[PDB]
Design an enzyme around this catalytic site. Structure first.
Site, short mmCIF file in Angstrom:
data_model
loop_
_atom_site.label_atom_id
_atom_site.label_comp_id
_atom_site.label_asym_id
_atom_site.label_seq_id
_atom_site.Cartn_x
_atom_site.Cartn_y
_atom_site.Cartn_z
N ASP A 42 -5.35 9.39 -3.51
CA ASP A 42 -5.31 8.15 -3.77
C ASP A 42 -5.95 8.08 -5.00
O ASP A 42 -6.38 9.08 -5.89
CB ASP A 42 -6.00 7.00 -3.24
CG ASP A 42 -7.35 6.85 -3.21
OD1 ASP A 42 -7.60 8.10 -3.33
OD2 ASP A 42 -7.68 6.37 -2.26
N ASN A 90 -6.57 -22.50 -5.36
CA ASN A 90 -8.29 -21.86 -5.44
C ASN A 90 -8.54 -20.01 -5.92
O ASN A 90 -8.88 -20.10 -6.20
CB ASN A 90 -9.37 -22.15 -3.99
CG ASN A 90 -10.46 -22.48 -4.48
OD1 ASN A 90 -11.01 -22.37 -5.79
ND2 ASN A 90 -11.56 -21.70 -3.44
N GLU A 119 0.86 -1.02 0.02
CA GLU A 119 0.06 0.16 -0.03
C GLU A 119 0.81 0.93 0.28
O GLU A 119 0.27 2.35 0.31
CB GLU A 119 -1.34 0.28 1.09
CG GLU A 119 -1.70 -1.46 1.21
CD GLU A 119 -2.53 -0.78 2.28
OE1 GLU A 119 -3.07 -0.34 3.18
OE2 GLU A 119 -4.14 -1.31 1.85
N1 LIG Z 1 -12.24 -19.32 -2.22
C1 LIG Z 1 -12.75 -18.77 -2.91
O1 LIG Z 1 -13.35 -17.75 -3.47
C2 LIG Z 1 -14.03 -19.87 -3.04
N2 LIG Z 1 -15.35 -19.27 -3.98
C3 LIG Z 1 -14.87 -19.68 -5.02
C4 LIG Z 1 -15.07 -21.73 -5.46
O2 LIG Z 1 -14.68 -22.48 -4.98
O3 LIG Z 1 -15.65 -22.43 -6.35
C5 LIG Z 1 -16.36 -20.32 -3.74
C6 LIG Z 1 -17.37 -19.30 -2.50
O4 LIG Z 1 -17.81 -18.43 -2.25
O5 LIG Z 1 -17.06 -20.20 -1.63
#
Ligand SMILES: NC(=O)CN(CC(=O)O)CC(=O)O
Ligand SMILES: CCCCCCCCCCCCOC[C@H]1O[C@H](O[C@H]2O[C@H](CO)[C@@H](O)[C@H](O)[C@H]2O)[C@H](O)[C@@H](O)[C@@H]1O
Ligand SMILES: CCCCCCCCCCCCOC[C@H]1O[C@H](O[C@H]2O[C@H](CO)[C@@H](O)[C@H](O)[C@H]2O)[C@H](O)[C@@H](O)[C@@H]1O
Ligand SMILES: CCCCCCCCCCCCOC[C@H]1O[C@H](O[C@H]2O[C@H](CO)[C@@H](O)[C@H](O)[C@H]2O)[C@H](O)[C@@H](O)[C@@H]1O
Ligand SMILES: CCCCCCCCCCCCOC[C@H]1O[C@H](O[C@H]2O[C@H](CO)[C@@H](O)[C@H](O)[C@H]2O)[C@H](O)[C@@H](O)[C@@H]1O
Ligand SMILES: CCCCCCCCCCCCOC[C@H]1O[C@H](O[C@H]2O[C@H](CO)[C@@H](O)[C@H](O)[C@H]2O)[C@H](O)[C@@H](O)[C@@H]1O
Ligand SMILES: O=C(NC1CCC2(CCCCC2)CC1)c1cc2c(F)cc(F)cc2[nH]1
Ligand SMILES: NC(=O)CN(CC(=O)O)CC(=O)O
Length: 901
Positions: A742, A854, A733
């Site tokens: 900003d 993920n 930041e």
């Molecule tokens: N880790 C995430 O972004 C989770 N997201 C993405 C997913 O796993 O499909 C789904 C949720 O809101 O639980």
């Protein structure tokens, strides 16, 4: 000191340019190997003497003036076949014609052939003694051309094939040049024995250590490249200074094992960087920064142990020192360049190809045994080693002889047959070389003076009992200048063991007025060499020990651990040299290993002291520094020892085993010097890798746990500031000490701290003055920004712990990953982070890999990839490494959520 400043830059750089590094350095190594194949025609056999000594001067003057003695170049025993005897005049005629033919064909190589056979009717008694009493054997002398040892040897090897075919092959060659040919051929024979017996064994040990094909293959390739480049370097060195024969095997006996061990350590460190979740690029950087440093420090230690050898004057030791230095330094260079570049290309692909590819914790408990009761193991270990020192004091030293070859060697046997059949001819007298300061001749009266003065000394051989029949003038041949201003007289010694005394006596005789006297002869050269080694051994040992202890203090940060190291290395050195005396002087081992018990080459003991001290220091620093590192680990007990032996156990055993394989190839050398060196290496290796590492140094060192790390050091070693959440966010930041707008156009300050959404700047000034408690003039100091930021993170954490979706995942996290989650909260809000239900749950279950994969699929990563990737890899590794080495700087500053007032 400069821990990790340059290595971090180089770790970035090898990943950045892996291809041209792996191209340029491979080109260099292979070109050097091609260039260094010619080494072997540019190596010398000379280097065993002290070229500044008086014996060497006597040799130079006497050879210049009388001509070098070429009478022992080649002796040839001829036995007439079919039980015919030397007086058979027809056999005489045919062998004369054959000898004359080979001489006529090789006048660039052979001065001529001399012997009784050239005048069988002669009345000369010495010439008559060139046949046996049974008239069945007669020897001839064949002097060769050339003006150094190496040229003469090459001439001998040119004419030897045709010379062996004389008398239908019933000719036996002995003397200095056949022996030198055999002794120097041992080198290549040991080379190929290492090639056929050690490379596969190193392959199995490597594959056992790693388990996959590529990881095991990389250190082998690095070792091969090191061998090639080091032979190239040695040939280049040969262009300027002479390089001894024995320098070639040292490159592969010492260098190859070190190269491979460096490689293997780098590769295993890379693999465990990958296993901890790091980027390939992060992996490469962190392995060079951690393991490349210790590889390089090992190189510095080995060089520091080798360079004191340069005090000794023998070119033999100088060539070997150059070879060691070249090999180990190239090995370190290669391990942090070619190898790092290769690994940068491969990434996790190093574990791809498994065992099946066909085309053609135990440590920790053993240390707990020694740990809980140490003295019961320290004492017997400590006394067996001193009663292995007891054979040391006896050591015998001598020169090169036929007995350096195995007893079953045919050439050695021809020499022994010549001495058994013609006992009087092989002599090594002492010479008195008289040189007049003025150039005028030496009178007969001055020779009579020196002759009488020499007669005053006892212990000189006397065949005929006559005053004048002693100290005869040396023979003169065609090569001598015959300068009248210098004359030589010589006589053999009664007792070969009374040389050093007699020489000194000969050197104490007040010589005539106006002349200078150099006493030479082979006993003189050998004894002067021995005196030079014994005279420089003190300073060599002192520099060795002081340099190594200073390096070890740098590594240990303690004044007691380096001293303990020094004395245990001295102790294993004394013990292993005692064992060597037990095997090679007294002979215990002679019959199995097929060698003759005898004194030892004098420079060998300097070489072996440096080599054993170096190995001991190397292995002991590698073992001990990872126990002293246990303060980064924060565990204050003497449990540092258990974890340090356990972390480096398999590694040390693998590295030791690989070097032991290579040296075990060489213990079988026909050359007793090579046998003795390889055996000393092996004994020291097994002594330090087991009896000292596994048992003694846990024992003696538990005698002092807290008393040994930085026991008494005043200011010693600075501890780097640990990274924190403030620096993390200062990167993400920005940190601004004056008010700014900003991306949304709002008055922000410090680390993403919104002051107001008012357009009036002085409204922001008022708010900042209220927040800081003073009139700031819109400017704050960095510590004020830090406090404002800490208040913002306190608000963030309050909010997190009040949120039912975040409090569980937050509570289950360590401090670093907590800082990553707080980062996310600052960037996007509690609600924002709370939308990551799957990811958050994977984090709560410590599924770092799954959560990272993920989170990389989010719109958050899509809109701010650099920040998100930093946060995600922080979730992966649980460390600050993504921030301690990040990409560029930020440009778009955006105030965070949870701005506190
Ligand atoms: N880790 C995430 O972004 C989770 N997201 C993405 C997913 O796993 O499909 C789904 C949720 O809101 O639980
Ligand atoms: C890989 C290991 C290989 C080891 C094999 C070596 C064993 C055989 C060694 C052969 C040595 C021949 O020695 C014979 C020579 O000795 C001295 O001169 C030698 O010593 C002098 C002073 O150093 C130098 O100046 C001379 O050049 C040098 O010829 C004598 O003056 C010479 O008259 C004599 O001919
Ligand atoms: C580690 C390796 C050790 C190797 C040890 C080997 C040592 C070998 C030494 C052999 C030297 C023996 O040769 C010595 C010969 O040379 C010359 O010949 C001459 O003899 C007669 C006249 O004297 C005539 O026949 C000739 O006109 C004339 O040439 C000398 O005058 C003699 O003294 C001797 O005959
Ligand atoms: C990776 C490690 C690489 C290390 C490489 C070191 C190579 C050393 C280069 C020269 C040898 C160093 O030692 C000194 C050496 O000088 C000699 O010759 C020189 O005689 C005169 C004396 O001053 C000079 O003036 C000449 O110019 C010069 O040729 C011989 O060469 C050696 O017998 C001797 O010892
Ligand atoms: C006569 C020889 C001529 C050569 C010139 C002499 C220069 C003397 C020092 C050269 C600096 C080369 O690097 C030496 C560095 O290595 C050491 O290793 C230790 O830290 C490494 C990183 O983790 C790991 O090796 C282990 O932690 C631990 O052994 C330490 O980092 C420092 O002591 C030093 O910074
Ligand atoms: C500690 C871990 C592992 C350490 C060891 C690693 C492998 C090293 C061994 C490789 C080969 C073993 O020996 C093979 C050698 O012996 C035989 O010749 C000689 O054998 C004895 C002297 O060498 C005497 O019987 C005679 O002089 C002669 O017959 C072969 O004909 C040689 O060609 C070969 O060199
Ligand atoms: O194995 C020798 N070091 C070992 C020390 C352990 C390593 C340190 C770096 C990480 C892996 C373990 C590498 C290899 C060794 C030293 C030595 C010497 F000083 C003279 C000599 F002649 C032979 C030697 N070998
Ligand atoms: N300005 C930047 O490079 C970083 N950007 C986002 C990014 O791409 O990582 C701003 C931010 O930190 O939110």
């Amino acid at each position: 000191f400069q821990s990790n400043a340059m290595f971090a830059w180089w770790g970035r750089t090898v990943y950045q340019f892996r291809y041209i590094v792996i191209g340029v350095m491979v080109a260099l190594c292979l070109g050097g190997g091609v260039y260094g194949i010619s080494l072997g025609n540019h190596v010398t056999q000379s280097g065993f003497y002290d070229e500044g000594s008086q014996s060497v001067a006597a040799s130079l003057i006497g050879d210049e003036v009388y001509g070098r003695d070429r009478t022992s170049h080649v002796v040839a025993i001829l036995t007439p076949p079919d039980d015919k005897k030397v007086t058979d005049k027809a056999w005489q005629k045919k062998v004369t014609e054959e000898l004359d033919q080979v001489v006529k064909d090789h006048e660039d190589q052979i001065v001529g052939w001399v012997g009784w056979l050239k005048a069988p009717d002669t009345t000369d008694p010495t010439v008559s003694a060139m046949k046996t009493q049974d008239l069945r054997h007669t020897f001839i002398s064949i002097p060769l051309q050339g003006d150094d040892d190496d040229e003469i040897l090459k001439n001998y090897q040119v004419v030897e094939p045709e010379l062996q075919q004389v008398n239908g092959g019933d000719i036996r060659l002995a003397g200095l040049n056949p022996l030198a040919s055999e002794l120097t051929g041992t080198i290549g024979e040991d080379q190929k024995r290492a090639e056929v017996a050690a490379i596969p064994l190193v392959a199995v040990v490597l594959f056992f250590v790693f388990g996959t094909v590529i990881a095991a293959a990389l250190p082998a390739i690095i070792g091969g490249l090191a061998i090639a480049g080091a032979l190239g370097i040695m040939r280049l060195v040969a262009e300027f200074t002479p390089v001894h024969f024995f320098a070639q095997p040292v490159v592969t006996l010492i260098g190859l094992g070190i190269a491979i061990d460096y490689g293997l350590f780098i590769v295993s460190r890379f693999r465990e960087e990958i296993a901890e979740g790091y980027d390939t690029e992060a992996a490469v950087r962190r392995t060079v920064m951690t393991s490349g440093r210790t590889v390089v420090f090992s190189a510095v230690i080995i060089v520091a142990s080798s360079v004191p050898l340069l005090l000794f004057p023998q070119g033999f030791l100088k060539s070997i020192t150059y070879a060691i230095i070249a090999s180990v330094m190239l090995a370190a260079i290669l391990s942090i360049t070619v190898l790092a570049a290769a690994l940068a290309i491969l990434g996790p692909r190093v574990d791809a190809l498994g065992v099946t590819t066909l085309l053609k914790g135990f440590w920790g408990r053993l240390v707990n045994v020694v740990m809980k009761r140490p003295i019961a193991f320290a004492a017997p270990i400590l006394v067996v080693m001193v009663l292995l020192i007891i054979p040391l004091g006896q050591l015998s030293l001598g020169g090169i002889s036929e007995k350096y070859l195995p007893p079953d060697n045919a050439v050695r046997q021809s020499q022994e047959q010549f001495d058994k059949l013609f006992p009087g001819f092989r002599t090594e007298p002492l010479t008195l070389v008289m040189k007049r300061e003025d150039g005028e001749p030496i009178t007969d009266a001055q020779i009579a003076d020196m002759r009488a003065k020499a007669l005053t000394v006892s212990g000189f051989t006397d065949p005929d009992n006559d005053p004048e029949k002693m100290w005869k003038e040396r023979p003169a041949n065609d090569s001598g200048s015959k300068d009248p201003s210098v004359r030589v007289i010589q006589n053999g010694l009664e007792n070969r063991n009374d040389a050093a005394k007699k020489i000194d006596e000969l050197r104490a005789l007040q010589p005539p007025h106006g002349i200078e006297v150099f006493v030479g002869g082979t006993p003189a050269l050998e004894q002067d060499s021995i005196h030079s080694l014994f005279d420089k051994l003190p300073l060599m040992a002192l520099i060795l020990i002081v340099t190594t202890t200073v390096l070890m203090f740098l590594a240990f940060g303690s004044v007691v651990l380096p001293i303990k190291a020094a004395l245990m290395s001295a102790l294993t050195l004394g013990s292993t040299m005692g064992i060597l005396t037990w095997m090679f002087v007294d002979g215990h081992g002679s019959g199995l290993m097929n060698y003759t018990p005898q004194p030892l080459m004098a420079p060998m003991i300097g070489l072996i002291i440096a080599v054993i001290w170096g190995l001991s220091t190397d292995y002991e620093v590698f073992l001990v520094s990872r126990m002293v590192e246990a303060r980064e680990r924060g565990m204050s007990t003497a449990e540092a020892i258990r974890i340090g032996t356990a972390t480096t156990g398999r590694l040390i055993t693998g590295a030791a085993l690989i070097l032991a394989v290579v040296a075990g190839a060489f213990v079988f050398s026909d050359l007793v010097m090579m046998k003795y060196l390889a055996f000393g290496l092996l004994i020291a290796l097994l002594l330090d890798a087991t009896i000292i590492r596994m048992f003694l140094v846990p024992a003696v060192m538990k005698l002092l746990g807290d008393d040994c790390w930085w026991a008494p050091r005043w200011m010693k070693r600075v501890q780097e500031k640990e990274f924190n959440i403030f620096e993390m966010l200062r990167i993400d930041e920005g940190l601004r000490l004056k008010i700014y707008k900003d991306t949304e156009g709002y008055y922000t300050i410090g680390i993403g701290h919104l002051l107001t959404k008012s357009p009036s700047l002085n409204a922001a000034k008022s708010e900042l003055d209220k927040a800081i408690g003073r009139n700031t003039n819109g400017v704050i100091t960095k510590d004020e920004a830090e406090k404002l930021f800490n208040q913002d993170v306190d608000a963030a954490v309050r909010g997190i712990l009040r949120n039912a979706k975040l409090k569980p995942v937050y509570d289950s996290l360590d401090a670093v990953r907590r800082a990553a989650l707080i980062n996310m909260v600052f960037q996007m809000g509690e609600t924002g982070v709370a939308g990551f239900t799957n990811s958050l749950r994977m984090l709560q279950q410590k599924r770092w890999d799954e959560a990272a994969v993920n989170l990389a699929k989010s719109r958050w990563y899509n809109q701010t990839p650099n920040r998100a990737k930093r946060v995600i890899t922080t979730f992966r590794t649980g460390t600050w490494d993504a921030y301690e080495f990040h990409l560029g700087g930020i440009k778009a500053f955006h105030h965070h959520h949870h701005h506190h007032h």
